[PDB]
Amino acid sequence: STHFDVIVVGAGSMGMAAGYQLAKQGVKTLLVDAFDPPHTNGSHHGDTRIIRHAYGEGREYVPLALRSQELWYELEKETHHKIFTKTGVLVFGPKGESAFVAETMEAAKEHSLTVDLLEGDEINKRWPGITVPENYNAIFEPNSGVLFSENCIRAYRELAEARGAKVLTHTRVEDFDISPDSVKIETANGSYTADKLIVSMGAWNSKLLSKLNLDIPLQPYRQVVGFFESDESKYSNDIDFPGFMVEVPNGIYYGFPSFGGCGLKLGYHTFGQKIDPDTINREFGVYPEDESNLRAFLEEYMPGANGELKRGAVCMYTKTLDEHFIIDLHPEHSNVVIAAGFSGHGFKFSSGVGEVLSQLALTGKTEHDISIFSINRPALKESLQ
Numbered sequence: 001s002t003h004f005d006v007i008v009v010g011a012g013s014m015g016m017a018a019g020y021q022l023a024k025q026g027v028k029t030l031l032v033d034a035f036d037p038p039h040t041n042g043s044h045h046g047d048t049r050i051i052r053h054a055y056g057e058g059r060e061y062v063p064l065a066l067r068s069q070e071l072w073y074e075l076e077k078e079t080h081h082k083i084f085t086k087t088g089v090l091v092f093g094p095k096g097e098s099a100f101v102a103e104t105m106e107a108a109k110e111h112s113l114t115v116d117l118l119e120g121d122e123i124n125k126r127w128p129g130i131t132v133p134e135n136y137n138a139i140f141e142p143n144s145g146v147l148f149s150e151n152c153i154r155a156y157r158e159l160a161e162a163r164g165a166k167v168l169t170h171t172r173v174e175d176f177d178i179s180p181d182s183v184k185i186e187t188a189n190g191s192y193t194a195d196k197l198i199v200s201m202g203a204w205n206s207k208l209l210s211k212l213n214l215d216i217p218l219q220p221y222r223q224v225v226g227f228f229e230s231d232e233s234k235y236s237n238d239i240d241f242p243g244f245m246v247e248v249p250n251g252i253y254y255g256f257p258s259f260g261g262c263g264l265k266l267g268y269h270t271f272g273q274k275i276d277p278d279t280i281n282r283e284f285g286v287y288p289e290d291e292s293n294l295r296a297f298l299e300e301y302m303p304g305a306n307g308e309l310k311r312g313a314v315c316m317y318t319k320t321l322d323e324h325f326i327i328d329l330h331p332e333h334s335n336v337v338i339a340a341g342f343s344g345h346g347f348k349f350s351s352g353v354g355e356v357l358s359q360l361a362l363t364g365k366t367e368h369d370i371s372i373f374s375i376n377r378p379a380l381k382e383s384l385q
């Protein structure tokens with residue numbers, strides 16, 4: 001008995017931000033989620049998320065990063081939940097041996113971003129606790145920081161619901177029926193129709209997009225993080241230890257300073273187990289690599305933060321072949337919006353993406369340049385069934 005203006009399937013990082021943007025405009029919105037966001041079964045938990053502006057994955061992301069940062073500052077002012085801490089973000093790697101570092105530097109130059117460049121011992125001297133070889137160089141971004149992701153989703157949800165948005169929890173959408181002038185979703189708890197549909201199922205996009213006649217290579221990965229007892233006089237946010245994403249011989253690692261003494265948090269970015277979102281083992285430590293890959297980095301670069309494992313978490317990345325997002329209209333249905341393949345680095349942009357999804361759903365267009373996220377790009381290898 002209840003039609004909606006817009007239905008959002010998957011009320012996570014991207015869907016809830018879209019829900020907030022829609023509700024803010026008086027658009028009657030229904031958000032449906034398999035669980036109760038924020039939760040620990042998707043890609044948004046683990047407390048913290050890094051947001052960077054000079055983008056090593058590609059300078060073309062800068063505008064969205066800057067717009068997202070401003071939207072995060074707006075969210076901070078609207079809710080009592082803590083949204084962002086300006087820890088700054090340090091990026092480093094072997095000189096001349098890191099495309100990531102190199103593109104971060106180019107992006108900063110190209111967009112006139114405020115950053116400090118340093119190398120070797122200067123890194124170790126500036127931040128006691130970091131020990132890198134002398135042939136390493138770095139780019140520090142002081143105005144970048146850390147987002148409290150679960151707080152963001154919770155805030156976007158409270159605000160959207162305050163404005164009339166309805167969130168149907170613990171309801172897994174199983175199929176879609178799309179027509180030229182309306183959309184319909186099917187769930188065990190009933191079916192619903194609307195004029196527009198936004199699909200942002202995270203890891204499950206790799207399993208249910210075929211229900212929309214889409215065939216896109218999307219690979220879910222098991223990605224763990226660990227919190228370690230650390231020397232608080234060095235790794236605390238209070239003494240300005242930064243968030244970071246760095247590149248060493250064996251891959252990319254990212255981390256956060258200890259907040260309130262909860263310990264430095266670390267994650268290995270370039271390695272993960274290919275899994276299925278419905279059978280993944282969410283227990284940290286079941287694979288020897290979970291803990292060993294982290295300490296391997298710590299004992300070498302942040303030895304004072306290699307103490308007792310205080311906590312672990314298991315979460316998921318959903319990768320595309322080129323590792324760029326998919327934000328576009330469904331090729332066969334202009335009334336359906338797709339948001340997928342955030343490949344492990346999309347949370348920082350979720351506020352910005354929420355805005356883009358809203359525009360796409362309401363107008364079929366967006367003011368942002370989102371061509372690099374086109375669902376029709378060749379590097380994606382997309383097709384219809």
Ligand SMILES: *Cc1cc2c(cc1C)nc1c(=O)[nH]c(=O)nc-1n2C[C@H](O)[C@H](O)[C@H](O)COP(=O)(O)OP(=O)(O)OC[C@H]1O[C@@H](n2cnc3c(N)ncnc32)[C@H](O)[C@@H]1O
Nearest residue numbers: 010012013014034042043050173202204315342346347348
């Ligand atoms: C896992 C991970 C990711 C990560 C990170 C560290 C780890 C361990 N650190 C990041 C960082 O420092 N900076 C950054 O910018 N990103 C970082 N990430 C990546 C980021 O967290 C992910 O890209 C982001 O969360 C992706 O968002 P998306 O909205 O795609 O995924 P979600 O938040 O999991 O939400 C999906 C929701 O949809 C629901 N769902 C699924 N299937 C259904 C069905 N069938 N019906 C209804 N709802 C469905 C889920 O329940 C989920 O809530």
Ligand SMILES: [Cl-]
Nearest residue numbers: 317318343344
């Ligand atoms: Cl992801």
